[PDB]
Amino acid sequence: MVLNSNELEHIHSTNHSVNDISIRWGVIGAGQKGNKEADLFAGYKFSNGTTCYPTLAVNFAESDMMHLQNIIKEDRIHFDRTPSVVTDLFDPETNPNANGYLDKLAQELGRKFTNEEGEVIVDQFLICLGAGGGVGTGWGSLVLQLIREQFFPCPVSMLISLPSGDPDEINNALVLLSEIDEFMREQDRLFGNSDIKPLANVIVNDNTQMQRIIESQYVNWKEVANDNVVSTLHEINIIPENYGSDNVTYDPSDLIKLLSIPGRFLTIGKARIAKFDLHSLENSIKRSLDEGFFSAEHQFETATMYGGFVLRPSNADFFKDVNTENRIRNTLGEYKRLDEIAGKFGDPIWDNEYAVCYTIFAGMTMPKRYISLAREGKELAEKQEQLRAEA
Ligand SMILES: Nc1nc2c(ncn2[C@@H]2O[C@H](COP(=O)(O)OP(=O)(O)O)[C@@H](O)[C@H]2O)c(=O)[nH]1
Ligand SMILES: [Mg+2]
């Protein structure tokens, strides 16, 4: 059983009835980053020892998989550094024999995500990519195509990492984010507000932002980032199914709507609160949204939907108070006025000593990290253009 956060450790040592999640993810991880994250999801188990997430890892290099932990070799899909090469190999025209590549994929997909009775055991797909790579980013474009060709039995969610500072990795990331933004706009004019979107959301993480948080607190920066990112997603999946409130309960259906309907960019703040004061509460909430693992200068006022919950002790006098539920409403209100959009904010109960406040904004436009990333990007391909002058 994989337990890669204090929150998950507590939960499983206290609750022995963790037998269900809010939304049944099917995790596909592509490229080394993607595989490594998928590998973690694969490790999660219910209280009764069953796997939580059916998980495939996909790659072109078999060296980016031979050292995985929780993914059976059978579930390591292999095909015998430019995003084009991935897409190209899966085109009826561009590659001659791309017929026996689509097929392998579609087969293994049915193998891992369908019943015997040809049903589907998953609610949405969670695809993991370190945008910037060749295998990874390439798979980003590939997925967007497959979604048009209605290849997937249900909606797709993308978990995407943004590169630190390699000018090539930056290019790939930008063309992908660009291609994503362009899918999202098309999706917006093809489907209504109420409608279930084929691309449910995209969750981004900034490597620069993440490395920074990590050095603040031997230790591997990506191993730590991965644990935080993945555990958070798992936690927000676990909690609404396994923890209720006497006041306001964020239940699974609420989360499902939030992850399924907005159809654009999504972000999460996880804030630990032990300091039970209105001030330091406000502060760690703000910290988690602006300088947390999921932050990338998001455009908060473009959010069409919100959600989240503060997980608190059984006698948390504080999280009962009007001003508490008022200060929270106001702190969040600074990012997006809450009376404007759909959502719900819970306050579930748990056996713990501290609390944790989870915050989610969905349906946002392109994060501004795109801009500050590009600025970097252009100002580099010029520097090459010049150094290309010399000789
Ligand atoms: N957040 C995060 N980023 C990673 C991790 N591993 C690699 N990356 C970065 O994500 C990008 C993805 O490329 P990588 O997966 O290493 O190779 P490729 O996808 O097979 O081409 C690179 O820019 C890596 O620096 C990880 O575990 N976590
Ligand atoms: Mg690789």
Q: 310: which 2 tokens?
A: 């503060």
Report, in angstroms and rounded to the nearest whole number, the Rg of the chain calculated over CA atoms: 21
Distance (Å) from CA 130 to ligand 1 centroid: 5
Distance (Å) from CA 375 to ligand 1 centroid: 22
Overall fold of domain 1-391:
Rossmann fold (3.40.50)
User: How far is 313 from 325, CA to CA, in rounded Å?
Assistant: 16
Q: Which residues make Cβ contacts (< 8 Å) with residue 183, sequence separation at least 6? A: 144, 147, 199
Q: Indicate which technique resolved this structure.
A: X-ray
Unique residue bearing structure tokens 């990333």: 373
In 3D space, the residue among 256, 285, 267 whose CA is nearest the CA of residue 356 turns out to be: 285
Query: CB–CB of 268/231 below 8 Å?
Result: no
User: How far is 255 from 241, CA to CA, in rounded Å?
Assistant: 10
Binding site membership of 231 for ligand 1 (Cβ less than 6 Å): no
Binding site membership of 83 for ligand 1 (Cβ less than 6 Å): no
Pairing mode of beta strands 355-364, 265-273: antiparallel
Q: 78: which 2 tokens?
A: 């292999």
Tell whether the torsion through CA atoms of 223, 226, 232 and 238 is positive or negative. negative
User: How far is 278 from 166, CA to CA, in rounded Å?
Assistant: 42
- Run of H or E including 139: helix 135-148
Binding site membership of 235 for ligand 1 (Cβ less than 6 Å): no
User: How far is 128 from 354, CA to CA, in rounded Å?
Assistant: 31
Q: What is the resolution of this structure in A?
A: 3.0
Question: What is the C-alpha end-to-end distance of the chain, expressed in Å?
Answer: 57
User: How far is 136 from 262, CA to CA, in rounded Å?
Assistant: 25
SS3 label, residue 353: coil
SS3 label, residue 141: helix
